[PDB]
């Protein structure tokens, strides 16, 4: 709200939107860029947000500010966009910040789910997949929320270097984020004895 | 906000409202139903919300979706109500579950 000689936030709606699979593959992993728009399903509605309420553009992912004992991160925008002043009016401003975070993930027996460093639960087995009978592993999400890419080469966002050895990349779109990790067979990877 | 060829959430206000004692006794425990309206005191104001912005009705409580290692739950609505499209307008929609 733009009053006389002062401005006040009537509201700040903050949301986390998953990056679609095609954007993770074609834009982030291939070119190190994100779309300036966020199009996603929230509250049973398809919603589209435009950064600075402008047309869609490709924006470069840059390293986040260094923090102690913190993993690597990248983002596109560091400033929040607020609407320009118009006196005696309520105005709205949209900020879209594409964020990529390398995180540690932990799973306890029987490994039907795992957690991320952010504290977000993923209700899918870390070993879920399409091969070696891993399709029988637990999943809570719909089939279209999961994707598995064979022969995936990870391109580093900082050094811009393509990975030498391919991996099997699991991608899962939760309602808040998309999580990608390397698929490995369960039996050689975990044990109940140490 | 309903723009042209796109819609965007300007805001999503989320609240949890207590079920009044008489509703717990007479409706939920006696009939397994809930009122479609939430009338409660929030921020020193009596606020009333109507599901889908419609008249008050009695809605059956149905078992929630099964999850592993979770206790029993019941709810009335599984879909969030959003206002119908009207171009170049901000519209509000209420969901009471």
């Amino acid at each position: 709200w733009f009053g006389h000689r002062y401005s006040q936030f009537m509201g700040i709606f903050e949301d986390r939107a998953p990056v679609p699979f095609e954007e993770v593959i074609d834009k982030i992993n291939a070119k190190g860029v994100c779309r300036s728009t966020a199009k996603y399903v929230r509250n049973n509605m398809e919603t589209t947000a435009f950064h600075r309420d402008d047309h869609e553009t490709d924006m470069e992912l840059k390293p986040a500010k260094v923090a102690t004992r913190t993993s690597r991160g990248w983002h596109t925008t560091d400033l929040k966009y607020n609407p320009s002043r118009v006196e005696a009016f309520h105005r709205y401003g949209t900020t879209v910040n594409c964020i990529v975070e390398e995180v540690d993930a932990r799973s306890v027996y029987p490994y039907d789910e795992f957690v991320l460093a952010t504290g977000d639960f993923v209700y899918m087995s870390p070993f879920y997949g399409y091969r070696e009978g891993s399709h029988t592993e637990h999943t809570s999400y719909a089939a279209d929320r999961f994707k598995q890419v064979d022969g995936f080469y990870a391109r580093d966002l900082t050094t811009k270097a393509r990975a030498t050895s391919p991996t099997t990349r699991n991608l899962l779109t939760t309602p808040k984020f998309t999580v990608a990790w390397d698929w490995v067979p369960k039996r050689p990877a975990v044990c109940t004895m140490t | 906000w309903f723009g042209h060829r796109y819609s965007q959430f300007m805001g999503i206000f989320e609240d949890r409202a207590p079920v009044p004692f008489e509703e717990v006794i007479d409706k939920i425990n006696a009939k397994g139903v809930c009122r479609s309206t939430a009338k409660y005191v929030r921020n020193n104001m009596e606020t009333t919300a109507f599901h889908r912005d419609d008249h008050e009705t009695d809605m059956e409580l149905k078992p929630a979706k099964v999850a592993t290692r979770t206790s029993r739950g019941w709810h009335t609505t599984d879909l969030k109500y959003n206002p119908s499209r009207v171009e170049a307008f901000h519209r509000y929609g209420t969901t009471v579950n």
């Binding site: 399903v41 049973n44 509605m45 398809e46 957690v115 639960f121 209700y123 | 979706k65 599984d78």
Partner: peptide
């Protein structure tokens, strides 16, 4: 607590349907 609260939409809502 985090596990049970972050299952809320999977139990009481629908995260896939688009109206």
């Amino acid at each position: 607590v985090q596990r049970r609260n972050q299952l809320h939409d999977l139990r009481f809502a629908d995260i896939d349907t688009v109206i």
